Amino acid sequence: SIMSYNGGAVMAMKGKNCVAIAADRRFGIQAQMVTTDFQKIFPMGDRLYIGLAGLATDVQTVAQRLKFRLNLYELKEGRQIKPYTLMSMVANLLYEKRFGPYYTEPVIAGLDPKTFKPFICSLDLIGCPMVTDDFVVSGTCAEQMYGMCESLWEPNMDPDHLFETISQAMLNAVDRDAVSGMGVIVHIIEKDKITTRTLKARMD
Amino acid sequence: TTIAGVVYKDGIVLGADTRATEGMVVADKNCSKIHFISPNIYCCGAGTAADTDMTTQLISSNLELHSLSTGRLPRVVTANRMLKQMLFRYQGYIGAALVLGGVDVTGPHLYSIYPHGSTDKLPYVTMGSGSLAAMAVFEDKFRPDMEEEEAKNLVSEAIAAGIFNDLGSGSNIDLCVISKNKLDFLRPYTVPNKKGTRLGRYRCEKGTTAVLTEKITPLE
Amino acid sequence: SLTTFSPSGKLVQIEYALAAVAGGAPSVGIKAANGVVLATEKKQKSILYDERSVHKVEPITKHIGLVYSGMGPDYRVLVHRARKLAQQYYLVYQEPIPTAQLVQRVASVMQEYTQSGGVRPFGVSLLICGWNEGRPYLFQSDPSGAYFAWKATAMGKNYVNGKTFLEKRYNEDLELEDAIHTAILTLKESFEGQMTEDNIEVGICNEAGFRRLTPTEVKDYLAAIA
Amino acid sequence: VQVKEQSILELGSLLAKTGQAAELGGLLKYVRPFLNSISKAKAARLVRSLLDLFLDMEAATGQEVELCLECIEWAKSEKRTFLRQALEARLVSLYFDTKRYQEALHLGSQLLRELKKMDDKALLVEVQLLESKTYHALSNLPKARAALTSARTTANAIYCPPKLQATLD
Amino acid sequence: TGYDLSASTFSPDGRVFQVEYAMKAVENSSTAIGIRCKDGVVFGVEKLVLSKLYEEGSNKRLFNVDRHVGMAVAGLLADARSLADIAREEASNFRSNFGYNIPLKHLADRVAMYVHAYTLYSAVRPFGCSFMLGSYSVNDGAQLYMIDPSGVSYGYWGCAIGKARQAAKTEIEKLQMKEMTCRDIVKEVAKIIYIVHDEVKDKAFELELSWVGELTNGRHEIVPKDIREEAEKYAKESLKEE
Amino acid sequence: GFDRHITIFSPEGRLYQVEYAFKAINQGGLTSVAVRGKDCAVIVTQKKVPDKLLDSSTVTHLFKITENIGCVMTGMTADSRSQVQRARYEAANWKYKYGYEIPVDMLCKRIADISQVYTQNAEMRPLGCCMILIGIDEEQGPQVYKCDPAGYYCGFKATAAGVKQTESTSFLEKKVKKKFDWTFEQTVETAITCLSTVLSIDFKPSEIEVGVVTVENPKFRILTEAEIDAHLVALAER
Amino acid sequence: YDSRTTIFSPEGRLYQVEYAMEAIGHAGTCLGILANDGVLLAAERRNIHKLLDEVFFSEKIYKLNEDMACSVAGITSDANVLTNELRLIAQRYLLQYQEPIPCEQLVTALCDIKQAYTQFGGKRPFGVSLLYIGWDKHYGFQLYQSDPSGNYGGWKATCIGNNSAAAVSMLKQDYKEGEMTLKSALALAIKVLNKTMDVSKLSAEKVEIATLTRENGKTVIRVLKQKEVEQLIKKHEEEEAKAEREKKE
């Protein structure tokens, strides 16, 4: 598939007062390997991150375009975006090309800029929103981390327990996919800080 | 996917399942498919979920701008009319299968709408992957001038039959009854299926994963 | 027309616009701690007219409202543009529009409509009210497009004396809906015949949203209160 | 379904027509707890109508002054202002009629500060006139004359001497 | 003055002078009479020949905008040709879209809309031609209409336009055309034309007569030559005996 | 360059051309009056024929704009017919794209916006006719509306339009002061007497046009000569 | 039907651009000073009235991006349209190039588009003048002044106020070259607004001050709070107490 041309794996998990968002760092062309230092999670808020898996050029293009529209929005309003509003913006941007769609799965994870309510949602190749309270997914190794979700999730995580759970989830998901892995970046977003950890993974 | 609608003596009863699927896996276990159209008209969507969402949203939108331009309550067949023009202009490339139900000054109205633009008026309609089981339930049990609670039970058991007989339908049932004097949206009418309990403990304890590089950014 | 700069650096066209607005219908707005009241006076020319047929306030949405002073058909077409613009904001955004945003949208619309040639610029002034994020909002827009923030103001006929009166009144701490009685007083200072059941229109925007007042409670507030 | 809201017609009218004071107060407490069920405009108009029904009827002041006080406290529960100023206008009229001397002057400190916040005349004029009349009732020319002149500052605007400028004269 | 040079500006009294100048330009031209008989419509126009060098029959103001509809012209002839072309193509579009002969009132409405649309703006001047439309069918009888450049389309039993329009409609009114057949209508129209020719005020003239009706089987056409060349003949017996 | 010729604001913003258009409407020496009854609405318009040569059936100022709504014009005839056709177009467009009989207010609003965009720009005549609609709306009864070339409108219990405007309004107001449930034949009798006392002509039955739309007959209809003279001889003694 | 408004003067100039100049001449007042450590811009907001809500957070200041900021004078509507165009073109540059525009490229884009507006079309020019304050890696802190005529330049400290040339004259007489000294620059702005504005006593509820400074690779842009503004003001008028001490000597 054109989805499985580059691979890519994005996960986001919900905690009690925090969120987690992890992604594989592998970039390559099919079985050929290009670089193990590719960026899929992008910070567009003080507490609000977007994970993007899919076509790497489509990831970069939609990231630049949403940053474009986002800072235009924030300069126009004079206020920070809400995660629900960002979900609406992602849906509108992705649906603007229904006959010409970008080949990617966006994932939105963050806290409320005023109330610090956790928020996680995922959108398809045409911008249908799935706002969840437990987990959202993106990638070629989707069913692996689906199993990780349904066998590792419990409500009201501690941020460290959140980090460990999503770390083991992403590691065991990418260990069975030949087109995902090469190091995992994990962000834990809470009210007063954000901690990003690069995990030790399999390099084969 | 299983959506349905029934005309009863005082209005419309709409029902739907809450299972949203991608490929073979189910994506959303509590998806909402009954969509807000106007304070007297609602629609249930099926097929491509984003397509149904945008279609119901923009049609509904033109519904309240019409109401504000007219200063009066909107009607159902006007909504159906611009649904069918919006679908027919696009030659069915947008796969939105719709059930429109409402009550206006002319009375209750119910319609089934195809993605290619064909529209039908019936006292009872079914749509979705599990349309046939609910249609069989209705053909077995519907009679004209149905009471409200019995119609609620009929729609609920038809959606349950579509859930338990069609693979693309499952999880919960949501209802919406529209009357002249009231309107109630019973999102989780019944919960027929629950998640099984967990036996083993798979708690990823703290310190299980090693870290190469770290950063911490304090927030204002 | 292609109006340009005078040797004095003044646009005589927008001066004529505001002069025509100043001869328009008197109206008043006040922002209290629980919402915004807008109020206006409609003097029907004869008993032949129907007061309920045409209104002076129009709901853009559940929580946004705008009264006016000046031209009539200009006001109704601007109501159409404002409603439609707020609606595509809701289309792209799927959340109700805040007040100040549609304020600069309509101010921009005024800027091109006084900028583009061929078209005569508009001869209306608009007053906007809404309830966004708990804090109420009331603004004024001129034909030239310069939008101002006012917690209490008067626009239309004899607006300067009303402004001075609300300077004497309106300590801006009325947490209750007593400022509507102050608006009734402000209109009664310029009312021609009497404060009646239909000549005065009053609109409120509270936490529940913007709601046009039924003339029953308009007659109620006309009674006893003043 | 609220049709008893306007149902002060029979008994409320017959209170004034027949003439009785205790039954008026009993009606005032009769709809007093029910008063927090209707619109605020209807509540204000109903309170004003019931109060000025018997505020001119009878001099049996064993109930009426605390009825006015409890209506002030009800107004503070509603937090309505012009309602309030009308109430203390009524009580200072009742106090001048009953002539209990002292705290009528304690009206002024509780009035003037409020009436100089806004350019208000009619309430200010009547409270100044009644204060001057009460202070003359204790037979002290200087400060009563000073209050009379202070009322005579507001010798402008208005529309007529309906009750105001004729009482000034 | 500055308030008479545009078709989009208004006089203080509520008048447009461009269309009034158009009316004056129309009435400057010579005369033309349309008449409705019991079965059909007859058109009678006189045209002044300017010199014998013309090969006769030049710029005849009668045109066949439709097979079943004829029309008569006074005013400016180029605008008349443009309107005739518009009428022909609109009848063509009607019978292409609908598949039957267009009613006279409908096409009169369409050309009225067309001539009034050119009065709206200032980029185009009002026209300088007033014309008449006549038709007959068994489905509706005989129909006659008259349209001025301002856009007023009125039906008539008998109508006239031109310099001698006053005496023309005067002598139209003194005849009971509702009872006379087409053969009498021809001689009446010829007599009225000869009366209103006025002789001394103009040069030599020529006559043009056109027919529509059941005698022509509803298809509009010019008069035959044998029906012609008798107009002068019963003129010369009906001339004044001094 | 001054605005006495083209639509621009003035000192005190007086758009001279719109009052000029109002005088252009008053140039045509005709009048119409519309009266709404309890369950009926009537439009009574006078006409004049200069001669018997013209076909009197061709001259008509009342038009069946839809099957349930009637309209009547005053001003120059061609612009009147033009905006009749435009309102016809918009009514048919609404019926096609919505599927129900358009309420009278929506037609009124749309052509009011059309008049507004006429008078908004230059290079466009701001039109010279005034308009009356009569109709029936469900749960509303009869409705009578009026439009100007400036795009203004309102709701009227009864109104009039023509040269002799003001005395018609005064008579109508002093009659509606004692309104008291106007009935159908009484409405047409009052309208006929109003037009008669305004014109002081005591018209014969063949000089008038009457159009009545009723709740009992929601289809808009045109009064024939027989019932016209029947109502005249009904109002002859009174 | 008579509107040319696009042709040169019989002597060579343009009537429209000079009418725009004297239209800016009676507009509001805003001034800016460059420094080595940052840049400040102080304005007086007009129509200071008790009934204003003042909920726009220094409306005379417009943050064009995270780095470079704007101020405008003239017609408010044309100012809004123009500043929206500046946001559009700047963020189009950010889209085409994943780095901020330095300072001057956007200024040149504005000068181009306003020249095209005053070249043809037969429409009125936008009578707005703007001040641009920003930072770049190429030249540090950079300041520009865009007149509506299209001409622009790199003045270190200037204004477009109703007393523009007056404050330019006091700046020229009283500028220290190469000294950042941000507190002294604030004092300079305070005394300039003192001497230039006709009103006295320097009400903090009549003025606004915005500051831009490079910090941790972010170029933080702040608006001075009301308490800070009045504190700086009161420090300014108590500074002039020793000036009136020489008197006889």
From Swiss-Prot, chain B:
Expressed at a low level in colonic mucosa. Up-regulated in colorectal cancer tissues. The 26S proteasome consists of a 20S proteasome core and two 19S regulatory subunits. The 20S proteasome core is a barrel-shaped complex made of 28 subunits that are arranged in four stacked rings. The two outer rings are each formed by seven alpha subunits, and the two inner rings are formed by seven beta subunits. The proteolytic activity is exerted by three beta-subunits PSMB5, PSMB6 and PSMB7. (Microbial infection) Interacts with HIV-1 Tat protein. Component of the 20S core proteasome complex involved in the proteolytic degradation of most intracellular proteins. This complex plays numerous essential roles within the cell by associating with different regulatory particles. Associated with two 19S regulatory particles, forms the 26S proteasome and thus participates in the ATP-dependent degradation of ubiquitinated proteins. Belongs to the peptidase T1B family. The active site is at T1 (nucleophile). GO terms for molecular function: endopeptidase activity; threonine-type endopeptidase activity. This is Proteasome subunit beta type-7. The gene is PSMB7. GO terms for biological process: proteasome-mediated ubiquitin-dependent protein catabolic process. It is found in: Cytoplasm; Nucleus. Signal peptide: none annotated. It catalyses: Cleavage of peptide bonds with very broad specificity. Its EC number is 3.4.25.1. Its main location: cytoplasm. It comes from the Eukaryota. It is an enzyme of class 3 (hydrolase). The keyword Hydrolase applies.
Swiss-Prot record, chain C:
Belongs to the peptidase T1A family. It comes from Homo sapiens. GO terms for cellular component: cytoplasm; cytosol; extracellular exosome; extracellular region; ficolin-1-rich granule lumen; nucleoplasm; nucleus; P-body. Changing L102V: In a colorectal cancer sample; somatic mutation. InterPro entries: Ntn_hydrolases_N, Proteasome_alpha, Proteasome_alpha-type, Proteasome_asu_N, Proteasome_sua/b. The modification Phosphoserine is found at S6, S8. Induction: Down-regulated by antioxidants BO-653 and probucol. Down-regulated in response to enterovirus 71 (EV71) infection (at protein level). The modification Phosphotyrosine is found at Y16, Y68, Y113. The 26S proteasome consists of a 20S proteasome core and two 19S regulatory subunits. The 20S proteasome core is a barrel-shaped complex made of 28 subunits that are arranged in four stacked rings. The two outer rings are each formed by seven alpha subunits, and the two inner rings are formed by seven beta subunits. The proteolytic activity is exerted by three beta-subunits PSMB5, PSMB6 and PSMB7. Phosphorylated on tyrosine residues; which may be important for nuclear import. Keywords: Acetylation, Cytoplasm, Nucleus, Phosphoprotein, Proteasome. It is found in: Cytoplasm; Nucleus. It holds the Pfam family Proteasome. Gene3D superfamilies: Glutamine Phosphoribosylpyrophosphate, subunit 1, domain 1. This is Proteasome subunit alpha type-2. Its main location: cytoplasm. The modification N6-acetyllysine is found at K62, K163. CDD domains: proteasome_alpha_type_2. GO terms for biological process: proteasome-mediated ubiquitin-dependent protein catabolic process; response to virus. The gene is PSMA2.
From Swiss-Prot, chain E:
GO terms for cellular component: cytoplasm; cytosol; extracellular exosome; nucleoplasm; nucleus; proteasome complex; proteasome core complex; proteasome core complex, alpha-subunit complex. GO terms for molecular function: ubiquitin protein ligase binding. The modification N6-acetyllysine is found at K52, K201, K225. It is found in: Cytoplasm; Nucleus. One of its GO terms (biological process) is proteasome-mediated ubiquitin-dependent protein catabolic process. The modification Phosphoserine is found at S238. Induction: Down-regulated by antioxidants BO-653 and probucol. Up-regulated by bacterial lipopolysaccharides (LPS) and TNF. Transmembrane segments: none annotated. PROSITE patterns: PROTEASOME_ALPHA_1 (PS00388), PROTEASOME_ALPHA_2 (PS51475). Keywords: Acetylation, Cytoplasm, Host-virus interaction, Nucleus, Phosphoprotein, Proteasome. PANTHER family: PROTEASOME SUBUNIT ALPHA/BETA. The 26S proteasome consists of a 20S proteasome core and two 19S regulatory subunits. The 20S proteasome core is a barrel-shaped complex made of 28 subunits that are arranged in four stacked rings. The two outer rings are each formed by seven alpha subunits, and the two inner rings are formed by seven beta subunits. The proteolytic activity is exerted by three beta-subunits PSMB5, PSMB6 and PSMB7. Interacts with AURKB. Interacts with CDKN1A. Interacts with MDM2 and RB1. Interacts with the C-terminus of TBXA2R isoform 2. Interacts with DNAJB2. (Microbial infection) Interacts with HIV-1 Tat protein. Belongs to the peptidase T1A family. This is Proteasome subunit alpha type-3.
From Swiss-Prot, chain G:
Residues 236-249 are annotated as: Disordered. InterPro entries: Ntn_hydrolases_N (IPR029055), Proteasome_alpha (IPR050115), Proteasome_alpha-type (IPR023332), Proteasome_asu_N (IPR000426), Proteasome_bsu_CS (IPR016050), Proteasome_sua/b (IPR001353). Keywords: Acetylation, Cytoplasm, Host-virus interaction, Nucleus, Phosphoprotein, Proteasome. One of its GO terms (biological process) is proteasome-mediated ubiquitin-dependent protein catabolic process. PROSITE patterns: PROTEASOME_ALPHA_1, PROTEASOME_ALPHA_2. The modification Phosphoserine is found at S9, S71, S169. It holds the Pfam family Proteasome. GO terms for cellular component: cytoplasm; cytosol; extracellular exosome; intracellular membrane-bounded organelle; nucleoplasm; nucleus; P-body; proteasome complex. It comes from the Eukaryota. Gene3D superfamilies: Glutamine Phosphoribosylpyrophosphate, subunit 1, domain 1 (3.60.20.10). The keyword ATP-binding does not apply. The 26S proteasome consists of a 20S proteasome core and two 19S regulatory subunits. The 20S proteasome core is a barrel-shaped complex made of 28 subunits that are arranged in four stacked rings. The two outer rings are each formed by seven alpha subunits, and the two inner rings are formed by seven beta subunits. The proteolytic activity is exerted by three beta-subunits PSMB5, PSMB6 and PSMB7. Belongs to the peptidase T1A family. This is Proteasome subunit alpha type-4. The gene is PSMA4.
